[PDB]
Ligand binder design. Structure first.
Ligand SMILES: [Mg+2]
Ligand SMILES: [Mg+2]
Ligand SMILES: [Mg+2]
Ligand SMILES: [Mg+2]
Ligand SMILES: [Mg+2]
Ligand SMILES: [Mg+2]
Ligand SMILES: [Mg+2]
Ligand SMILES: [Mg+2]
Ligand SMILES: [Mg+2]
Lengths: 205, 134, 260
RNA sequence: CGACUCUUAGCGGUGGAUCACUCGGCUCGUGCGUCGAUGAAGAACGCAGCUAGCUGCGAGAAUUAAUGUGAAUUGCAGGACACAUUGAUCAUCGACACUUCGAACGCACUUGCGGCCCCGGGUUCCUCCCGGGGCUACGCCUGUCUGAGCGUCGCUU
RNA sequence: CGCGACCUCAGAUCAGACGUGGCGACCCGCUGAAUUUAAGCAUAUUAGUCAGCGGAGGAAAAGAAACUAACCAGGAUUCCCUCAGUAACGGCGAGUGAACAGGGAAGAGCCCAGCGCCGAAUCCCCGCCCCGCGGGGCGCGGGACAUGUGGCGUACGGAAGACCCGCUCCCCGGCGCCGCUCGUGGGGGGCCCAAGUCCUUCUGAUCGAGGCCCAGCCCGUGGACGGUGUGAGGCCGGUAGCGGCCCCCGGCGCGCGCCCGGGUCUUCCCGGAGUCGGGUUGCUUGGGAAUGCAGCCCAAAGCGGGUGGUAAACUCCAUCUAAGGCUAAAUACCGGCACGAGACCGAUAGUCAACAAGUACCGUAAGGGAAAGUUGAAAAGAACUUUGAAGAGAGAGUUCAAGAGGGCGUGAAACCGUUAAGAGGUAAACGGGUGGGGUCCGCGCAGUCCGCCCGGAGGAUUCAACCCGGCGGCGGGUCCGGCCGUGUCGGCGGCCCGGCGGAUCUUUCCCGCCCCCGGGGUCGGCGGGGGACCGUCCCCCGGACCGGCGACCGGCCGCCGC
RNA sequence: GGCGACGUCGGCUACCCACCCGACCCGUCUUGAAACACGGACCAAGGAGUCUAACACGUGCGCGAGUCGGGGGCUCGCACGAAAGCCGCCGUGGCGCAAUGAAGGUGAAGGCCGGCGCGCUCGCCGGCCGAGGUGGGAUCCCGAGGCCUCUCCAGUCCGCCGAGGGGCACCACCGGCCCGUCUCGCCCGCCGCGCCGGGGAGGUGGAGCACGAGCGCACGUGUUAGGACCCGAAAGAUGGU
RNA sequence: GACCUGGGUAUAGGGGCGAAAGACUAAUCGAACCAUCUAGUAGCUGGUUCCCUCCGAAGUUUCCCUCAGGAUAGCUGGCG
RNA sequence: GUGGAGCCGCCGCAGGUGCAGAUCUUGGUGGUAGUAGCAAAUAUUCAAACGAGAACUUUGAAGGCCGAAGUGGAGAAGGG
């Protein structure tokens, strides 16, 4: 059954696999179906924007991805609290709220607070019959378009810094080396041991 | 070219809707053209054929300037019988040979209260076709 | 072949009884009662390896080859030899990339379409399409395609303004948009060189849609047009050049046949 | 000579191959996504002027009413052509009707045997007298009526 | 001893309701093999699949954390692409084998018990009415439920009450009616282009030929099908934000019904048990010192509990809040009702089934389960004569054809009859080589050559040579008028009324801010916009070459036709 | 050069017949079949290496240190269109661009010149460069000489040219570098002087490096898993009559 | 006569029932029949469809619960 | 020659791609072959009638068999 130089293989076809096959012949028939689920939803709503509410700036987990910015679920209470808007009024403004999200940084806290005040100043509401509390005249001269596309304020916008040019100085071309990695890598793993020998000389008398 | 995606273009399903046709569809599909004198007086092209229309045959073995009335309209065999075109059998009894109404020209309609209302509706729906040319 | 021809209860007769060892159907009474059951031999059996609907029907071509073939499909529709040797009678027509002005895009009625092609001397190709109004040879007639036909000219445009309605009653004709061209329309049968009537605004847009060799395409993000493997391609001029024939030996033009 | 046998060919027979057709499949796809005690699915029987089957129907039984349509149905007869009555036919189908078995339901399944209630006539009827009509299955919920208890207790004698 | 209550329970053909069975493609709960693979076979694999059993629905199940994570952290479920044939499991053999980040589809959240608070402020049923259509009530008076706890405000994102502070008068349904509905809301009916023109073929045309310099006619209509054969125009139809009809639907405005939110501080409140968990025992899982589930035993806590993927003790940090509940979308669909199509099959195929197919028929039954399409355009289905008791003929007749005569299109081979020819004791058949006969073809038959040039013989016409008129092409030339290619630039020209590109530059520009003593310091930056520079593509003047299949005009040569 | 008219001339096939010679019946397993080995009375139609997944190698095409939209998304509501086109702040991801170790982890540039430290079997500073060397190596470069109607004076060329030179791919060898181990050894470093870090020199293990060649698509062959080229059990299991 | 026989009824598949033969249990019994799992599996029989051109073998080595088979080397062909 | 409505060449593409065998599947037909055979339970014969037609029908006569546990006369089951 084997032969000359080839691969040793484990095809997982020892199970009755012709019954559970999924063939995608309706896949153009469904791509033209859920376009119609968007178009006949977008005109169904309002001049309210398509593709739903506004999402936060959110940094990804897991060291491979922690250098980038993603759109999240909801802004949350801490960020809604500073911006001034109520936690249950926020989702009829068009702002999604995720109450189980935590803020433990302050840089990313103020990023979404700056994001959320920037949204409200480029939002125009419609009073029912024109009393207009916290709203003014004719609606931004008929609001300059009708309906937006795939994100309100371009939710990824992964941006980087300039940091143009420096001159290589002393204490910079001298010190911060490979050896500072290897010593800091050792000092993290000899940390608990060396604090145990320190107890031993304290009980030495 | 057909654009409506709810009506057939296959051979086998259009025949099956033809030979299994209901008898009220079957009077519609057994229609015959009016004569050139008479389609100018009524400005309508063709009419579903009935029992006492004066009529002449325009193609076939029996043809040519033989106005003579229909006498019996088989819908089941898609056939009118006309009182003059016949055939002697081997027995000597004479029988009506049957011909299809597409091969046949009405030369005098039989007007009743309904054949006014059919012509007027088939003629009124042509001036709106003229009114589209603006 | 839907499930199979395996909706039959049947066993081999096995032992002697002077019959083949193929499975026989059960029961008695009926004719179908001692007959050869499933197996690709039997009246009523199951076909060999019944065709499966998960066959790879569909093929990928990577898109620089799709755009490679669509630059080679347009460049041969400008050479009069290749477009006439595909059969399009383009004798009387003027200049081969035909460009009528952009007013043609607002034709709304097919009388205007017909005398257009007559005055561009391209009706004599549409009239050839009426000559191939045969019916199909073979069993494809009962699978509802009965008439074969030549494909004629293709009119390629931008900003449809009613032009699609005026030309589509004319047989054998094709209308494709200059933003979204098609290898299946421009090169029917796989052979290159279909006769085409461009419009001005379609014809100028080709420069910004495939790009020249100095500047890339603007409406296509990262595409520039493919370079040549031969620059001078008429080698009857190269081999008669004084640089070549200064260097050659001489022709050796005896025959030196077999000697008795 | 003739017969017999053999090989070719014509012509006739046996046989139903090939070819041409196709109101049938098969595959993929789209849209909807709806049974039943208010008796479903299914089964049995019956129903046409001449009708055994398939199809359609249910003692109103090859269909009724209505709306649309507007002169047929047809293998043969027969009958109303009436349509400024109501109008043949066919489709639609929203009104009515829908025998027997079946979850099948008075009890049994042997067309076997009841039990109350009312009706039309006979004893002008209670106490088992013709026909017809209504009612009578099991589970279980909320409520009602009836009432079991040396259960707990009150007021009593 | 009687009576009254209440609790536990009975009965009834009580009043009013409900459940049952089917279908089961997909979906949910259990139950569950073996063939097979390992070249044997037990663990393993097949497979938690087949069969068995129960429940649903137009979808179901899941679902708002007792999570993933371990860093700058994400944030219900479901589906896709990856992760990945990977970590892991395994006679570490055969084999098996998930997840989290990430990219997308879709996106929506909430409610109770408890803790307290409000005089049960609550619900059901009956009765007559406000007053009504197509029947549901808020309004009225009685019988129950209910304190063993109905209703309101409340849910872990915290909550409540009292302050103080600055806002504010709301939403929901029903009823009439007008105004629209993005493919232009749905359902149903009945309508809407243009040759049957002239010749012609034929059994019959839809064939073939023809229509002035307006292209014979129509075309938003040349899909299709049917009609005596191949049809844009003879006929259904198809095209069209075509018309008119009938019903049905989602949403503006008069009358009901409901209606104080937010911030700050202070005080008080704050949670689900034979459950978690541990033991052991089965199953299951990639889950390995046990992932999940289940039995039995033991059985909690409250700064607790669960989780943190190697058993344990110590510690710190992270994270979540379990043992109660609802919830749309993206998803699945070989059953159903309707549809559209196809590089499919063409009556031994394709469904078993194109037809009186789940039919005849078979088996006690479960179950098994076929054969079977084709006259012709139209029955015009062979009258009448004659032989025979009739089948069956011989004539006649219909039809283009009976050489289509009622399982009748075409009508193969095996097999058989017949006629013709040939032959025949080593069974027949065959290879090779000639011969004899035969069928038939080709030539046409002692009658076969065909075009080239020349000199002979008479005939018959007009050009050639030469020139002139005349249009058209070939080739060379100042590149002359235009012309574009490639390097060199400049006018920084069009950069501010130029395109793009650049992880070039500018802490003096311009906007919302951080770092110290109302202001201020480039005092180091942040979010955004500006304008310089470089890289490449757009015109003007010069210069460079070739004027390259990019060309026209002039003039030259030599052809050509008139 | 000669010969021949209405029955003659020529011709051949799936025609028939004669004769001489040669000749056992196919398929099959098999050392060996005409076999006293098996299958086949005869004709018609049917009838057996397929499709999907994975991989290997060859070949063809596009781009090329990159390549690839397959998953979504966009485009007026379009027969053909279930197609085609487009996206790029949709390149997430996949394979490739980096190996090695069980793991913690580490992780691929040398040669010359000038000088100095005991120029000490060891090295240090600066400059030049820049993938080391040897032997073969297609091709290309140089080339004394050679070849032309009368003799000395000059030109382009061409052919021959011993010898010499730079050497592609590739092969053999020697040396170097990275990772794991092993022996021997000495020096340096400091967000803190240690059961800390770094380096050396020789020897061996690796699927490495030594100026990238892959990726996508298509076709072919082979292997495998699947009913797997068709047909075949004696068995086994579930559920029923 | 431990007699024969009709009808009714009871016992059902690893079960029935047997004066015992592994008899009988619907022409089937050393484990019935019907359906499905199932197109079960076979190192073993049988078959495996057009022509021409070119090249053209092996039954031996080593291992294998291996001896009717496979892997491995050799022989072979194709691309170069 | 039949036949009566469709079909083919070239360039690419795609397969349910070509038969002599499989005790092959389905259908058809031969030789054997006018052959084996139309032989269990004793048996028929004469005239006539009807009829196109009589070894076989009906009738008349003769001869025979079942021989009362029947080849006689009635039923259950089953058949319909
Ligand atoms: Mg179809
Ligand atoms: Mg054919
Ligand atoms: Mg047949
Ligand atoms: Mg009626
Ligand atoms: Mg009663
Ligand atoms: Mg019961
Ligand atoms: Mg339902
Ligand atoms: Mg042999
Ligand atoms: Mg078993």
């Amino acid at each position: 059954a084997p032969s000359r130089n080839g691969m040793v293989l484990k095809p997982h076809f020892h199970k009755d696999w012709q019954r559970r096959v999924a063939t995608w012949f309706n896949q153009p028939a469904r791509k033209i179906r859920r376009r119609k689920a968007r178009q006949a939803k977008a005109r169904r709503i309002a001049p309210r924007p398509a593709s739903g509410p506004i999402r936060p700036i959110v940094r990804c987990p897991t060291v491979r991805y922690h250098t980038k910015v993603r759109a999240g679920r909801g802004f949350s209470l801490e960020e809604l609290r500073v911006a001034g808007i109520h936690k249950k009024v926020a989702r009829t403004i068009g702002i999604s709220v995720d109450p189980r999200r935590r803020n433990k940084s302050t840089e990313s806290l103020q990023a979404n607070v700056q994001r959320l005040k920037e949204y409200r100043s480029k939002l125009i509401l419609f009073p029912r019959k024109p009393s207009a509390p916290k709203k003014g005249d004719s609606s931004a001269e008929e609001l300059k378009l009708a309906t937006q596309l795939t994100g309100p304020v371009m939710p990824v916008r992964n941006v980087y810094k300039k940091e143009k040019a420096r001159v290589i100085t002393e204490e910079e071309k001298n010190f911060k080396a490979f050896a500072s990695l290897r010593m800091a890598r050792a000092n993290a793993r000899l940390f608990g041991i060396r604090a145990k020998r320190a107890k031993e000389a304290a009980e030495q008398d | 070219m057909k654009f409506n995606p709810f009506v057939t273009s296959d051979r086998s399903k259009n025949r099956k809707r033809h030979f299994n046709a209901p008898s009220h569809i079957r009077r519609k599909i057994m229609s015959s053209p009016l004569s050139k004198e008479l389609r100018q007086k009524y400005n309508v092209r063709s009419m579903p054929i009935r029992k006492d229309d004066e009529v002449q045959v325009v193609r076939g073995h029996y043809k040519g300037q033989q106005i003579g009335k229909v006498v019996q309209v088989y819908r089941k065999k898609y056939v009118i019988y006309i009182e003059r075109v016949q055939r002697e059998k081997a027995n000597g009894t004479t029988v009506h040979v049957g011909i299809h109404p597409s091969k046949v020209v009405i030369t005098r309609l039989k007007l009743d209260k309904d054949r006014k209302k059919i012509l007027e509706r088939k003629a009124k729906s042509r001036q709106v076709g003229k009114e589209k040319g603006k | 072949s839907e499930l199979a021809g395996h909706q039959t209860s049947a066993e081999s007769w096995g032992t002697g009884r002077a019959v083949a060892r193929i499975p026989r159907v059960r029961g008695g009474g009926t004719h179908r009662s001692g007959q050869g059951a499933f197996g690709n031999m039997c009246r009523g059996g199951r076909m060999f390896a019944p065709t499966k609907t998960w066959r790879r029907w569909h093929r990928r071509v990577n898109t620089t080859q799709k755009r490679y073939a669509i630059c080679s499909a347009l460049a041969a529709s400008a050479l009069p030899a290749l477009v006439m040797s595909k059969g399009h009678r383009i004798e009387e027509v003027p200049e081969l990339p035909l460009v009528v002005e952009d007013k043609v895009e607002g034709y709304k009625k097919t009388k205007e379409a017909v005398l257009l092609l007559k005055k561009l001397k391209a009706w004599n190709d549409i009239k050839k399409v009426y000559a191939s109004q045969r019916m199909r040879a073979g069993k494809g007639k009962m699978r509802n395609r009965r008439r074969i036909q030549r494909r004629g000219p293709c009119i390629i445009y931008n900003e449809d303004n009613g032009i699609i309605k005026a030309f589509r009653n004319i047989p054998g004709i094709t209308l494709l948009n200059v933003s979204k061209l098609n290898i299946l329309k421009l090169a029917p049968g796989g052979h290159v060189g279909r006769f085409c009537i461009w419009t001005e605004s379609a014809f100028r847009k080709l420069d910004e849609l495939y790009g020249t060799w100095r500047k890339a395409a603007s409406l296509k993000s990262n595409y520039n047009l493919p370079m040549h493997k031969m620059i001078n391609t008429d080698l009857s001029r190269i081999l008669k050049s004084p640089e070549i024939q200064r260097a050659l030996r001489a022709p050796r033009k005896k025959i030196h046949r077999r000697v008795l």
